[PDB]
Design a binder for these strands. Structure first.
Ligand SMILES: [Mg+2]
Lengths: 337, 182, 413, 130, 287
RNA sequence: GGUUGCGGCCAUAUCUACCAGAAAGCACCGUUUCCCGUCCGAUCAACUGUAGUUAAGCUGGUAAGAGCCUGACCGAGUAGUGUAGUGGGUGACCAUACGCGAAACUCAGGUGCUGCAAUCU
RNA sequence: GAGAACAGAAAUCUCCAGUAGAACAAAAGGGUAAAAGCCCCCUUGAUUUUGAUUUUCAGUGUGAAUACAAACCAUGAAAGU
């Protein structure tokens, strides 16, 4: 490396007036749902950060009395801190703490000594990091991720904690919503769903089928527009993501007007991702259905979502009562009958 | 006394040239050369037009900057200056645009092959068997160091090397003149 | 450089159209620098303009020899000498007849402005380096007597000094840790911060007996200040700078200047404030109550400085988060947060007109804000290193600053 | 080295591929190339968005985001690939350090040269170029 | 050798051309009063101005070659040849060029009533400020001859095309007005060039900030008479107006973001037909 | 009306030999303590105005002085020059018109005006 | 032109005369005059990034050149260059 005034030569210096202008413009950053980012100009965001606040986190108490004086053989903290002002306020605070403790205890098997049976491994899917690594691969490889959502319960189909990762690590990604299986729900329900999800994502309607289907032309025009937005890229990859058995492989076969991807009712038919081409300017992609783990996953709710294959459940009969919680009695009467 | 002014036909404005135009009909009697007052009416009309222009120019947003000491060409923070819109009055160009570009018979071959533009990183390059860098161009050159070496181990060879360098220079000048011909 | 993006062509077409026609005592802000003044080969630690005129000024540094400066000529004037350690702090008497400074060594030395010679034997007694000084206000002083000089040290003891006898008329040791600062209020009750996370108002009239002990901060107090500190420091020296014809006239003018600010609410109750390392600040009215009127808070890092506005209407404080925060002077309510500094702020000085606030930070470029617009007024680059200190002249004609570059610099409109 | 011979397909004969075995600054707008056109590979585990630049002045050291790879010696095509390899210069966001050039134009970026080998540890240390 | 390269760069078609230089050419017939009017007009043109002490016998309408030669030799595309004759008294043949080739020509003979700058109030007039313009009369925006005179005066006196200007620099305003309205086919009324020094005073009745304006004439006074005229060929008019030229569903959002837009259209949901599930049909029932 | 600083026009302003400059303001001048640079305190830099001079620069006046410049309906709307008609002729070219339109030459005049601030018997 | 030990018509030195047939890459050719010529002092620059073209295929918020424009540079007291 030869010596030069560069490298010890200034590069990114900027005037303070530009910083004040960006600080004034930070409040104008609101964006329409139709708007989509293409490039994030490099700015000293650390100087523009630190919005006004009145929280003032806890002071570094360790500097005055770290560990030794507070307790131990030295025990130099002879007296309690804050010198409670009055005995009457002390009795009031004690009564308030006792009432709060009683209210906490009021909130709530071991007494018989039995323990819950171990959870079936089938509910763990899709954990084991395999489908998760496939999801991260299709996300990084896709110029524009799209997230399908079941029309029956799009709020329960959301893959939360993943969209935040796409927003943070990869702001450029669009992550447009899709709402398939409109035929299984009343059209007014899908209309209200798209009206509610329009605030954040386009939530384009769809009903995958190699036969006649709704919305294939709108999704095709939208993909053509996104490809027009990335002419410099030389093409635009796309990658379906969502819960298992969301119809991503069916939506891809509908976009191709052919039975390209294998499609079965069982959630696990998509063993692995496969590349697909249409118009030579865009490549479809799909990954196995993702199930962001959470303590609220309410296993029986994992079953009602279709994520688990019902054949493997040890006790299919015990899940029957919950199906009545959702379906109306008149439909279950008319169907069976 | 009031700064307000108005005409049946609103005045046209070009704030970029600091210019304004008035389509309102002129009074032929006031403009007659014989009148002693002819200068006064023209002065009042120019004053009204300048008042309208100042009413327009004063409304333009003004730039501000905190820089004050050591600015190369920045305006002083105490100073304020109007943001003039680019002029709407097109004017003829002074000279034809320099559109006489030529590929010089090389850029086409570069497009036909995998060749790529030179890195343009720097003339300097480390000399062999030496503790200090010897630039290849723009300063004492290692290519000319061969003439300065005490022995060539082979007519003087240094004269042949200078002849080869002059031949390369004349070939470059000939290629430049040939590209000048087209 | 990342220039602001060019306006869109539609914005230019809109700008081409006619637009935005609608038929329907003051200090000049500093905006420019001045030639550097070479001096002692040590970083400047403090500076203070002479209350009676901006032409005179003095600054401490790591050199033992304090240097008075002739700001009108930007040249050294009657350099001080005698100390054997760093001049940790400097302060001018409100009457202006005597200078005072606190060396890192225990010795303290008064100086005569007329020649710069030390005014008698150096004061002594402190067990540790001096921390701050506070001259007694002239209006409390009886005519024909020199104001007493308060003093403090890292040991936390304070010793009131009789400048005539050069002896400590009183002493106290109620603080268990270092006294970060001390100030002599116009009500006759002394106040001072401490490193022990405590503040203790003192009544000098009662032989220095203590009367109250504040206890609200989560961390050590720093830079105690009062709304009246500007009037107590200026010494009844109005911006015109005319000297009073008689000492009794000086006492009357000082009492009038104090009453003009003390009675802003119709009653004589000066406000008090105490910065702390707990990212919090507290308004105080010790005569009214032992508990804060409000708990100012919001800074992301420890406050380094506080300065009441000369009228007392506004409060402001330096912080390590690189964002000075204005606050109301009557209740401490938040107003606006200044921004622009790239590094932790050290101290700030209010303009005499109250419309501006010069500031400095660890970043080499000191700045001054126009408080009325709640926005930066003009940057003041030029310092080669950190601007450790800044101060504004009482008349507002000039400003001075120090730093680690060992190059004192003056600023003026 | 620096190019692992990845193999692919039912018959691993051509293998048509290479992969970097060292850390690389892929950039904020990577948008992985489609696999069919993917010859070179820079696996995400080896990528880093930050480097532990240290300022010789004041003795301070701070973790700051990487900005760009300026000059990599030893076939700077590696600099086109973003490799650091114990000596490559890299732009860094120096705004956290408080640097301010004369004239009031506050700095927010400065060059830095990596020292520690990325391959031997996950940290990317570098000395700031004052 | 580098010094010649700077002159060559100055004699080049920059994408943002420098303000055109002026080169007054006194004539062999020029009267001393015409030379005084020429110096007066040149004083407004500073600093981008030049002079040639030698007298000349140029005949631009009879032979344009010498003007095209001097325009290249002096790098002054603008030219204003002084001339006088028994018929065309006090002639002032303004000239313009594109590439040093002739662009247009027009005669602007001075009226006998011209007044020199010395015959006016001695108000301060800072050099190098950009004059304001205030054209009057509808013919300037419609008549091709008056439009050419307006474009010529603007190209001559507009000065630098700065993107920003101080209010302090508006110390003067050039003015022009036609000698009344005229019916089509009538002889062109003489132009009335004028100049005035700006003045300002408190208004108190027209806004807190806007000041009352006032003018004081400083000259030079002139009343040009139109004469022979020439116009560029249409291909020259096309070549001289081309922009340097140095994006749909894309825009530079504030803060530099290059936000796009999908602009998704209306999509009726009624075209879809819900699946005829056995539980929805009314044909089945119980009880 | 004289003069100093800044200027605009850029020989009506420059060159040659003499004469005058009352009062006021440069300048010549005397010196090398200090800042400063040359081989040389000659120029440059600095010192106060002290010993003086209007001897020079400089402002004016003179000269059948040399150049230069101004306007005249002075050459002159002349010379030169494109235009039409077979008007003459084998033709070149010649008279008839309105256009663009000179100069040498002749007559008379002059050898600097002018803005800002200041000062002067 | 007047001159200067050796020294003359050609050495180097001095005074009065110069619109510059000085050396300004220069070619028609206008022109440079307290310089664009001679002498003396200090110095990098093939620095960084923003866009519109250039081909590329780990085509990439530029990975690199071309042109645009902002910082930075050297100088001077500065104008400015
Ligand atoms: Mg399935």
């Amino acid at each position: 490396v030869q010596p030069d005034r560069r490298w010890f030569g200034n590069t990114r210096v900027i005037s303070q007036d530009a910083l004040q202008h960006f600080r004034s413009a930070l409040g104008e950053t609101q964006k329409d749902t139709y708007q989509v980012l293409l490039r994030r100009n490099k700015l000293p965001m650390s100087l523009l950060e630190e919005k006004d606040a009145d929280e003032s986190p806890k002071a570094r108490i360790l500097d005055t009395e770290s560990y030794a004086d507070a307790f131990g053989p030295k025990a130099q903290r002879k007296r309690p801190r804050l010198a409670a002002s009055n005995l009457e306020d002390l009795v009031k605070a004690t009564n308030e703490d006792i009432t709060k403790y009683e209210e906490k205890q009021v909130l709530d098997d071991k007494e018989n000594g039995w323990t819950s049976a171990a959870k079936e491994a089938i509910f763990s899917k899709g954990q084991s990091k395999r489908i998760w690594n496939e999801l991260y691969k299709v996300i990084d490889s896709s110029d524009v991720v799209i997230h399908v959502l079941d029309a029956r319960d799009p709020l329960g189909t959301r893959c939360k904690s993943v969209e935040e990762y796409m927003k943070k690590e990869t702001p450029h990604k669009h992550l447009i919503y899709v709402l398939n299986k409109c035929d299984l729900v009343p059209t007014w329900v899908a209309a209200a769903w798209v009206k509610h999800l329009s605030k954040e994502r386009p939530t384009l309607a769809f009903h995958a089928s190699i036969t006649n289907s709704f919305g294939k032309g709108s999704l095709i025009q939208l993909l053509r527009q996104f490809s027009q937005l990335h002419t410099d890229r030389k093409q635009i990859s796309v990658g379906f993501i969502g819960y298992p058995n969301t119809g991503k492989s069916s939506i891809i076969n509908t976009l191709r007007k052919k039975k390209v991807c294998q499609v079965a009712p069982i959630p696990g038919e998509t063993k692995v991702w496969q590349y697909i081409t249409l118009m030579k300017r865009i490549f479809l992609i799909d990954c196995p259905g993702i199930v962001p783990p959470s303590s609220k996953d309410s296993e029986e709710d994992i079953l009602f979502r279709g994520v688990v294959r019902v054949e493997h459940v040890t006790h299919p009969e015990q899940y029957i009562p919950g199906v009545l919680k959702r379906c109306q009695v008149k439909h279950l009467e008319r169907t069976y009958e | 006394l009031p700064v307000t002014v108005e005409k049946p036909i609103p005045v046209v404005y070009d704030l970029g040239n600091l210019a304004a135009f008035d389509s309102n009909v002129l009074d032929k009697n006031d403009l007659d050369s014989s009148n002693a007052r002819r200068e006064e009416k023209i002065k009042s009309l120019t004053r009204d037009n300048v008042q309208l222009l100042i009413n327009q120019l004063l409304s333009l947003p003004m730039k501000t900057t905190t820089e004050s000491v050591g600015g190369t060409g920045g305006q002083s923070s105490v100073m304020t200056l109007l943001q003039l819109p680019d002029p709407t009055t097109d004017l003829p160009r002074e000279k034809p645009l320099p559109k006489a570009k030529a590929m010089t018979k090389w850029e086409k071959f570069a497009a036909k092959k995998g060749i790529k533009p030179k890195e343009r990183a720097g003339k300097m390059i480390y000399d062999e068997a030496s503790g200090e860098w010897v630039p290849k161009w723009g300063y004492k050159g290692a290519n000319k160091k061969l003439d300065d070496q005490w022995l060539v181990e082979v007519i003087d060879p240094r004269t042949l090397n200078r002849a080869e360098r002059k031949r390369l220079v004349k070939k470059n000048e000939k290629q430049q003149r040939r590209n000048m011909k087209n | 450089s990342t220039l602001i993006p060019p306006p869109s062509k539609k914005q230019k077409k809109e700008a081409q159209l006619p637009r935005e026609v609608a038929i329907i005592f003051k200090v000049k802000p500093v905006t420019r620098s001045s030639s550097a003044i070479a001096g002692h080969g040590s970083t400047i630690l403090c500076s203070a303009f002479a209350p009676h005129t901006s032409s005179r000024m003095v600054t401490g540094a790591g050199d033992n020899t304090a240097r008075i400066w002739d700001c009108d000529t930007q040249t050294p004037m009657h350099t001080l000498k005698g100390h054997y350690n760093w001049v940790l702090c400097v302060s001018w008497s409100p009457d202006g007849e005597v200078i005072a400074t606190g060396s890192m060594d225990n010795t303290i030395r008064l100086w005569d402005p007329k020649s710069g010679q030390c005014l008698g034997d150096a004061l002594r007694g402190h067990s540790k380096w001096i921390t701050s000084l506070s001259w007694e206000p002239i209006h409390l002083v009886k005519p024909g007597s020199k104001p007493r000089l308060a003093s403090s040290s890292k040991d936390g003891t304070i010793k009131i000094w009789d400048t005539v006898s050069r002896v400590c008329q009183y002493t106290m040791s109620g603080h268990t840790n270092s006294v970060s600062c001390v100030k002599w209020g116009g009500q006759g009750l002394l106040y001072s911060g401490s490193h022990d996370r405590t503040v203790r108002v003192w009544d000098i009239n009662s032989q220095g007996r203590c009367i109250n002990i504040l206890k609200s901060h989560a961390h050590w107090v720093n830079h105690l200040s009062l709304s009246t500190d500007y009037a107590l420091r200026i010494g009844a020296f109005d911006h015109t700078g005319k000297k009073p014809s008689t000492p009794e006239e000086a006492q009357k003018k000082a009492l009038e200047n104090y009453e003009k600010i003390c009675k802003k609410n119709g009653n004589s109750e000066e406000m008090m404030v105490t910065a702390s390392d707990d990212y919090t600040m507290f308004l105080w009215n010790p005569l009214k109550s032992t508990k804060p009127i409000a708990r100012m808070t919001g800074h992301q890092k420890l406050v380094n400085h506080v300065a009441f506005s000369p009228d007392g209407r506004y409060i402001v404080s330096a912080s390590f988060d690189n964002s000075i925060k204005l606050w109301d002077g009557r209740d401490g309510k938040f107003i606006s947060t200044f921004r622009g500094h790239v590094a932790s702020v050290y101290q700030v000085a209010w303009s005499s007109d109250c419309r501006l606030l010069v500031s400095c930070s660890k970043d080499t470029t000191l700045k001054v804000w126009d408080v009325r617009t709640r926005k930066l007024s003009v940057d003041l680059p030029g310092h080669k290193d950190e601007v450790y200190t800044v101060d504004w002249s009482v008349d507002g004609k000039r400003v001075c600053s120090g730093g680690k570059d060992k190059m004192v610099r003056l600023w003026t409109h | 080295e620096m190019f692992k011979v990845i193999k692919t397909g039912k018959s691993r004969s051509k293998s048509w591929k290479r992969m970097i075995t060292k850390h690389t600054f892929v950039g904020e707008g990577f948008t992985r190339r489609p696999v069919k056109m993917e010859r070179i590979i820079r696996p995400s585990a080896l990528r880093q968005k930050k480097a532990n630049v240290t300022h010789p002045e004041l003795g301070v050291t701070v973790f700051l985001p990487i900005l760009a790879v300026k000059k990599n010696p030893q076939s700077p095509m590696y600099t086109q690939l973003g490799v650091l390899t114990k000596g490559t210069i890299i732009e860094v966001n120096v705004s956290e350090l408080g640097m301010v050039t004369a004239g009031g134009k506050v700095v927010w970026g400065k060059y830095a040269q990596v020292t520690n080998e990325p391959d031997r540890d996950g940290c990317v240390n570098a000395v700031l170029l004052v | 050798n580098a010094r010649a390269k700077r002159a060559l760069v100055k004699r080049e078609a920059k994408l943002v051309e420098n303000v055109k230089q002026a080169l007054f050419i006194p004539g062999q017939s020029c009267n001393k009063n015409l030379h005084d009017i020429m110096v007066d007009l040149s004083a407004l043109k500073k600093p981008d101005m030049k002079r040639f002490n030698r007298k000349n016998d140029i005949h631009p309408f009879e032979d344009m070659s010498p003007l095209e030669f001097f325009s290249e030799k002096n790098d002054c595309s603008l030219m204003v040849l002084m001339t006088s004759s028994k018929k065309r008294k006090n002639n002032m043949t303004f000239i313009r060029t594109f590439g040093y080739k002739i662009y247009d020509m027009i005669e602007l003979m001075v009226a006998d009533n011209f007044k020199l700058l010395s015959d006016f109030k001695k108000l301060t007039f800072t050099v190098g400020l950009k004059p304001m313009f205030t054209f009057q009369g509808a013919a300037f925006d419609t008549h091709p001859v008056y439009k050419q005179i307006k474009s010529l005066f603007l190209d001559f006196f507009r000065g630098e095309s700065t993107d920003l200007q101080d209010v302090a620099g508006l110390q003067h305003v050039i003015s022009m007005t036609i000698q009344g309205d005229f019916q089509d086919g009538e002889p062109l009324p003489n132009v009335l060039f004028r100049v005035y020094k700006l003045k300002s005073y408190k208004s108190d009745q027209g806004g807190k900030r806007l000041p009352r304006i006032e003018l004081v004439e400083i000259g030079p006074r002139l009343d040009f008479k139109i004469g022979r005229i020439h116009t560029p060929s249409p291909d020259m008019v096309t070549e001289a107006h081309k922009k340097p030229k140095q994006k749909k569903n894309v825009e530079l959002d504030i803060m530099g973001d290059k936000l796009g837009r999908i602009h998704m259209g209306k999509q009726d949901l009624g075209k879809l037909q819900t699946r005829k599930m056995k539980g929805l049909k009314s044909k089945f029932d119980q009880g």
